[PDB]
């Protein structure tokens, strides 16, 4: 029902980590030692799926990664949090909705069928010490512009690679709607100057990988403000960038952007996501609020990962859970707290040649 895809540098980093927890050379963090403790297998005698599968597992429902975290043992540690936000995942969805904040939104008359991709931007905010991605992409803390296209190219990648193949298996193109990610509570100090970054590493990413993307089509960029709209021609490609509150009546993410229909694309929107935390985030809490909230509440995300059907209401914009859990704390955390479900399924990577297969 969801998929677990990283690049080759995070199954790298990954392996590494697994060698050395081994070899005695670290000690996990707290939150990955817990969900190893409800197995019976070792470091040792696991494969490297189980243990992708178990990092990934230490995520919670609700996390922010901006402010709730420590970047040692009392968490989740430094190179835990390196491989953790790297990994994205996806899954078919239902949406609602076209995604707007607020009371903004517009009830799809009939729900569209499309897939959401939730990628994890760069954790340049902290309230204890500096982040993995900020010592990646920081030079004496000014933004370093090839540093950061590197770590979109990352993350980004083995999704465009999904979807590529995705679209060219159902006979469409592909039309992908890409919020202002990490250009909100994760850019920090950089928030005044940031939005111009996110715009060129999605700019350097298409323009390197497009003979490796062509039944990709449109890509509808939506910073909401701080961006001047555009429209650029990226080899086959037609990326715009469309802010909301620039542009009105910009088209919504979980809506199909100019010049694609059902009949002729396949509708992908990519999530802002966190790297300790299950897709839904803030909506796990019963929060309709950031990117990440927002596109999860506007779809059966939470129907997806918890396996239960939940009831869409169409007043609120909210997938509600079901009506024989809350009858009875009510929200989607406490019903996977009720139910015992943990956020672990299948992992793809790719490999040296660029194409995603197995961990093993
Ligand atoms: N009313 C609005 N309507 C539409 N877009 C908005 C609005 N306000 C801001 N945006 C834009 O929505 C875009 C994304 O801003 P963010 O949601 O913070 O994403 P991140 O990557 O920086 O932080 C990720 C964390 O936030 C989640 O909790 C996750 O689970 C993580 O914890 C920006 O371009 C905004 O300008």
Redesign the pocket.
């Known amino acids: 029902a969801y998929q677990l895809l990283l690049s080759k540098e995070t199954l790298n980093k990954i392996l590494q980590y697994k060698q050395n927890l081994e070899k005695g050379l670290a000690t996990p963090g707290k939150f990955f030692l817990e969900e190893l403790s409800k197995q019976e297998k070792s470091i040792s005698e696991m494969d490297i799926t189980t243990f992708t599968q178990l990092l990934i597992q230490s995520k919670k429902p609700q996390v922010?990664?901006?402010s709730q975290v420590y970047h040692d043992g009392t968490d989740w540690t430094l190179e835990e949090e390196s491989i953790l936000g790297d990994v994205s995942v996806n899954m078919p969805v239902t949406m609602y909705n076209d995604g707007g904040?607020?009371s903004s939104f517009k009830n799809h008359p009939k729900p569209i069928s499309g897939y959401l991709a939730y990628v994890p931007?760069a954790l340049l905010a902290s309230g204890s010490g500096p982040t993995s991605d900020m010592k990646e992409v920081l030079d004496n803390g000014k933004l370093n512009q090839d540093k950061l296209n590197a770590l979109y190219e990352r993350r980004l990648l083995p999704q465009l690679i999904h979807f590529n193949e995705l679209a060219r298996q159902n006979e469409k193109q592909a039309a992908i709607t890409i919020?202002?990610?990490?250009?909100?509570?994760?850019?920090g100090a950089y928030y005044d100057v940031i939005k111009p970054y996110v715009r060129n590493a999605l700019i350097h990413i298409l323009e390197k990988h497009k003979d490796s993307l062509p039944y990709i089509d449109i890509i509808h960029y939506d910073?909401?403000?701080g961006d001047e709209p555009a429209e650029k021609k990226i080899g086959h490609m037609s990326f715009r960038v469309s802010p909301?509150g620039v542009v009105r009546g910009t088209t919504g993410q979980l809506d199909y952007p100019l010049g694609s229909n059902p009949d002729t694309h396949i509708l992908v929107s990519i999530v802002?996501?966190?790297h300790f935390?299950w897709p839904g985030?803030?909506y796990w809490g019963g929060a309709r609020q950031?990117?990440?909230?927002v596109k999860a509440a506007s779809t059966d995300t939470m129907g997806q990962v918890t396996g239960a059907t939940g009831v869409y209401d169409k007043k609120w914009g909210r997938y509600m859970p079901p009506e024989s859990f809350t009858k009875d704390m009510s929200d989607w955390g406490d019903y996977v707290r009720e139910n015992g479900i943990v956020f672990n399924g299948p992992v793809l990577a790719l490999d040296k040649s660029g194409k995603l297969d197995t961990l093993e």
């Open positions: 922010f990664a901006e904040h607020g931007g919020p202002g990610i990490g250009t909100g509570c994760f850019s910073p909401y403000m909301s802002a996501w966190d935390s985030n803030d950031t990117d990440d909230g």
